[PDB]
Amino acid sequence: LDVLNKKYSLLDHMQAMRRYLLLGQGDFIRHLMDLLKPELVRPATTLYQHNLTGILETAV
Amino acid sequence: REIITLQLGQCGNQIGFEFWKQLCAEHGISPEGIVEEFATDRKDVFFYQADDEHYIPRAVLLDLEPRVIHSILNSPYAKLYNPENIYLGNNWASGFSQGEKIHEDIFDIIDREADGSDSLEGFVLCHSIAGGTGSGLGSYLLERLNDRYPKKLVQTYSVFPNQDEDVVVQPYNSLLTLKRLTQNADCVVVLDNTALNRIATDRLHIQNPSFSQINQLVSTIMSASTTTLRYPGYMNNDLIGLIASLIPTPRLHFLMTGYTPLKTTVLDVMRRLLQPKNVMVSTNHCYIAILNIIQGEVDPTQVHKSLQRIRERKLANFIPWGPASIQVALSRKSPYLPSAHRVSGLMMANHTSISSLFERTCRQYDKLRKREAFLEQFRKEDMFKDNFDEMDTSREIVQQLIDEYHAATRPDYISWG
Amino acid sequence: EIITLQLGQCGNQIGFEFWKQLCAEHGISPEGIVEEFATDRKDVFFYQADDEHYIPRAVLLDLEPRVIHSILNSPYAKLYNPENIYLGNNWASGFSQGEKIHEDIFDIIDREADGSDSLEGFVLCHSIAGGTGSGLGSYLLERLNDRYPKKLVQTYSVFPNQDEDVVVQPYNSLLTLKRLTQNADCVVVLDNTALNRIATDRLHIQNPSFSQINQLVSTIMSASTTTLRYPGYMNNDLIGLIASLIPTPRLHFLMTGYTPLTTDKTTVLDVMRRLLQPKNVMVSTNHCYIAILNIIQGEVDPTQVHKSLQRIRERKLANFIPWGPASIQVALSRKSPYLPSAHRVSGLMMANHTSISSLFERTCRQYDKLRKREAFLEQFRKEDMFKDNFDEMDTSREIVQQLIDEYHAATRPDYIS
Amino acid sequence: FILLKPVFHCLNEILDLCHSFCSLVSQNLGPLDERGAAQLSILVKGFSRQSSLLFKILS
Numbered sequence: 001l002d003v004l005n006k007k008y009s010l011l012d013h014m015q016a017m018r019r020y021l022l023l024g025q026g027d028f029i030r031h032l033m034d035l036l037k038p039e040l041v042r043p044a045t046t047l048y049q050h051n052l053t054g055i056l057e058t059a060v
Numbered sequence: 061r062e063i064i065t066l067q068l069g070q071c072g073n074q075i076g077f078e079f080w081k082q083l084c085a086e087h088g089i090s091p092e093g094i095v096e097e098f099a100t101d102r103k104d105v106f107f108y109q110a111d112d113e114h115y116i117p118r119a120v121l122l123d124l125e126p127r128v129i130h131s132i133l134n135s136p137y138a139k140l141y142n143p144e145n146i147y148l149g150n151n152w153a154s155g156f157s158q159g160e161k162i163h164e165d166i167f168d169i170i171d172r173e174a175d176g177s178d179s180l181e182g183f184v185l186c187h188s189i190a191g192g193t194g195s196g197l198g199s200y201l202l203e204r205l206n207d208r209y210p211k212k213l214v215q216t217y218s219v220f221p222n223q224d225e226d227v228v229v230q231p232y233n234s235l236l237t238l239k240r241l242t243q244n245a246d247c248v249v250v251l252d253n254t255a256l257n258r259i260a261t262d263r264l265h266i267q268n269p270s271f272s273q274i275n276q277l278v279s280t281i282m283s284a285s286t287t288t289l290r291y292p293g294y295m296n297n298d299l300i301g302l303i304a305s306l307i308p309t310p311r312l313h314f315l316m317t318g319y320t321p322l323k324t325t326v327l328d329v330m331r332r333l334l335q336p337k338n339v340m341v342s343t344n345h346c347y348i349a350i351l352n353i354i355q356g357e358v359d360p361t362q363v364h365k366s367l368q369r370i371r372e373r374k375l376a377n378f379i380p381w382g383p384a385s386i387q388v389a390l391s392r393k394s395p396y397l398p399s400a401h402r403v404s405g406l407m408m409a410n411h412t413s414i415s416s417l418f419e420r421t422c423r424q425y426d427k428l429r430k431r432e433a434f435l436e437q438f439r440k441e442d443m444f445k446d447n448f449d450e451m452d453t454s455r456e457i458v459q460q461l462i463d464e465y466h467a468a469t470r471p472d473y474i475s476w477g
Numbered sequence: 478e479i480i481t482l483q484l485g486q487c488g489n490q491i492g493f494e495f496w497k498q499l500c501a502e503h504g505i506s507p508e509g510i511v512e513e514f515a516t517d518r519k520d521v522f523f524y525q526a527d528d529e530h531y532i533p534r535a536v537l538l539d540l541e542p543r544v545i546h547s548i549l550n551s552p553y554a555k556l557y558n559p560e561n562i563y564l565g566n567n568w569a570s571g572f573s574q575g576e577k578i579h580e581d582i583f584d585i586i587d588r589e590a591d592g593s594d595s596l597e598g599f600v601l602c603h604s605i606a607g608g609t610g611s612g613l614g615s616y617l618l619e620r621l622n623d624r625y626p627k628k629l630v631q632t633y634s635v636f637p638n639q640d641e642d643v644v645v646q647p648y649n650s651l652l653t654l655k656r657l658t659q660n661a662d663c664v665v666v667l668d669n670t671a672l673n674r675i676a677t678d679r680l681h682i683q684n685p686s687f688s689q690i691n692q693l694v695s696t697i698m699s700a701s702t703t704t705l706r707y708p709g710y711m712n713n714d715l716i717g718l719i720a721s722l723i724p725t726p727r728l729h730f731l732m733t734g735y736t737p738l739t740t741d742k743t744t745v746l747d748v749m750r751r752l753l754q755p756k757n758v759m760v761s762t763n764h765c766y767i768a769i770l771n772i773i774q775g776e777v778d779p780t781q782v783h784k785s786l787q788r789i790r791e792r793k794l795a796n797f798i799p800w801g802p803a804s805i806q807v808a809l810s811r812k813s814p815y816l817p818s819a820h821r822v823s824g825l826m827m828a829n830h831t832s833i834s835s836l837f838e839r840t841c842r843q844y845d846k847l848r849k850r851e852a853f854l855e856q857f858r859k860e861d862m863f864k865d866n867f868d869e870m871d872t873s874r875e876i877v878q879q880l881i882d883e884y885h886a887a888t889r890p891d892y893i894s
Numbered sequence: 895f896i897l898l899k900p901v902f903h904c905l906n907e908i909l910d911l912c913h914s915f916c917s918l919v920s921q922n923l924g925p926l927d928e929r930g931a932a933q934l935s936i937l938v939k940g941f942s943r944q945s946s947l948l949f950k951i952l953s
Contacts, residue, residue: 030298
């Protein structure tokens, strides 16, 4: 427990994964829901990963 | 996404100063504006990270006459809310004529701070009702805000002259300001002079004016209401997502507010907030929607079962043309404060007894309008609106507002108000 | 390999600061001596010299020699040492006095162009409409392309708008601009208006700003000539450099910008975006960038630039709308040792934009109103003999109107035509 | 991208197409159709096709 709790930050990884995959961070989600909307209006074949990874990083 | 904070007039910039001073003391920010050493709170909504590592509030000290601004400036907070966007009058007619001529000088300031955004979405006003610099100029400015930015909300923390009558045009200045509130504004959190002046004696007495005491409560009201903006949460990170549950039709845009601290458990702060004595504002009446913010070291496990118990005993009543409830915003209490552990809950709710507060000033207008009276006997009225149509137009507009608020208290408000 | 052809009194002043700055950055004394603190490649510009008493390759042609004794008595004459110096203010007189001296000043080009191991192009340090440079530089520009048809002619022409006294200036500007359009290969433009404002922004200089403008242009212009003179092969001469900035031949004028104006944490995105900000830009509707490059110099972290473009791009801080795919580039380079106290990074702009059409519109208007007043046609004898029916000044208008039209047309998707 | 991929092969044909277009404008020189239109349009098709095959990278 003493290694995993700080050499691999296991408890922060739980706390962060709740901040993101469970929407807990809130701000990241309100802003990303805005910025990402005109991309996701379009049909799914017209979406590409370089738009998406850039806009994620922009929201972060 | 960001919120601007257009504090206006002599009273509004005092309580705005107190607001930024409270936000400064609550956030990790020095009176210099520089990052404090022990400083996670969220600043981007309210502060701009200028190149000195200066967190500058998104303010505008948008005043009209000189007195208190210099004493705000020469404080230890002199360079906090201040990238120098400041600017430089007794009644609605005079104030409107001055809000007109200057407006190129000040609209540039709004546009300047608006272009300082990633996405603006709010104009928080600190508006003094019936006061001279609040009257007229504020009403002119309220119309222009929606003309120039028709997609941006105007929200008013209006401090309201509910008291015994100094100025004889006092009822009119409240009526002619109320017109704009009743159509141009998107939300109005209303604070009452007598209710706060009573609540002063209800904890620590005052006599002839000592505004600096009741202002402490006003600052806790602003800070409490913006708390869920200033920290993360799964819900209510933004002003419109907060305001949407409370105002169900666009004419019900006024909110009464309650505040408890005048060990703890949520059921006792819920019960307290609901009692009439704790409302900071003075026929059947019923709640429309209630939201309360519990800022504290509270265990979240208690919060739901507290609602259920408060439901079962029916200590609160609503109106059955639509669903409603009390709604609870559990928040972290702020560190960087002393005794950041006393649970200190606030409520805001739409309740139809506020109609009577408007109806008081309607009746005061009718007394003066059925008398012969001092209709703003200064030439800035007589050269401007000597046909007197606007106040009677305002009076039928507020009479439709009273009728709409009383129409809200029937089972058939699915039909028209 | 490249040579400067500084001409008129303006050209000598920008060229005297050019060589006075070039020896400084290449570690060379006013005498051309390699200073004892000394890799590089002075080679292109710097005439490689017997003792490593390095020389420029500069042909110090001049006309009405009144001030230039005071440039030639400086210690930097030992740098411009080959004794290749040679001795009205209207465009026609300046053009025709060039013709009346031309033979020597043409031959002593070859006396140096035969010495250069591989001449590539000619750098015209020059002003639009400026006095004794007016006519003269544009006259040489008519001749260079006939006698040297493969070599490329670039003009670092500072432009006549000074926020704004010469009455023939708009006519001279039109007449020079017919040459700068029709006869140059590329033009880098500077507004005296913007440079006055920039001097008043960084410091307190506007009207006086002149010898100070020499420092600002030489800081721009040492950078524009940097990949020629130092290792790093992003494009190691004149002609890889510019092909990024011109898609269709007539549309070849380029804007200027130079990020850290008080350089004496930062990151690439700062030094590259501070460059596109039109207020930091040394230049003063709808506006496309047709293509952009930045030459950036200092301790760039090389992994940042690839990620910088995302946070430029997705916040729509640049706006590419040519008929095709062209966009924004970076040319990384060595810190240059003429800057003593330095910011750890800096950078410099060069971009084919649309908004320069505004200064062309001022130019065309300032010609047209004085042309249709017919008072500042002057009836002077040189002004009349060059064109007794003024047909060159007529035909000079339609080409710059087409530059207005082409700038108004390459801005649309139409430019398959 | 020199580690061996279809990306490298498609870049190789793009570079071959570039050199051949260089060769064409460097030999024809003057503004004359020396049956240059067929070769030029073939390279317009090859470039359009392999630019669209260059845009496979977003999968």
